[PDB]
Amino acid sequence: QLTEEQIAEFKEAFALFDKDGDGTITTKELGTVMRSLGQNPTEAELQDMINEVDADGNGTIDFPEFLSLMARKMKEQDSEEELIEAFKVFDRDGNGLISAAELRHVMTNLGEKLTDDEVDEMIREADIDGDGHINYEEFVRMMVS
Ligand SMILES: [Ca+2]
Ligand SMILES: [Ca+2]
Ligand SMILES: [Ca+2]
Ligand SMILES: [Ca+2]
Ligand SMILES: [Ca+2]
Secondary structure, eight states: OOHHHHHHHHHHHOOOOOOOOTTTTTHHHHHHHHTTTTOOOHHHHHHHHHHOOTTTOOSOOOOOHHHHHHHHHHHHHHHHHHHHHHHHHHHOOOOOOOHHHHHHHHHHHTTOOOOOHHHHHHHHOOOSSSSSSBOOHHHHHHHHH
């Protein structure tokens, strides 16, 4: 499941939070890590963050809990990065929007020679804000559906 080196890496990450090395991250120690990086969440906000990760409902995060989450997160990241890469290719001019001209061009490079009507239908179907283009959120919402 994990190598010793992965474990060690994860333990080093856990230690950043576990300011006192007691084997748990509290809402308070989370507050320290958030603050050091420029956020100042309320105790209510910290409690939600801990509650979302705290499996045994004991109020703090232990290493198996942290390890479990970071496996989740690292999957999510590999999913996301792929969606983002693909979007950026589709958006040839980098402007955050995939125009129909871009979509047609890249489809031609993917083996499909489409008409303007066909590509306009693809865009209509997926467009949410009405602008006749596809932004990242729109792009993701279609891809994962
Ligand atoms: Ca601690
Ligand atoms: Ca806040
Ligand atoms: Ca716990
Ligand atoms: Ca574009
Ligand atoms: Ca749009």
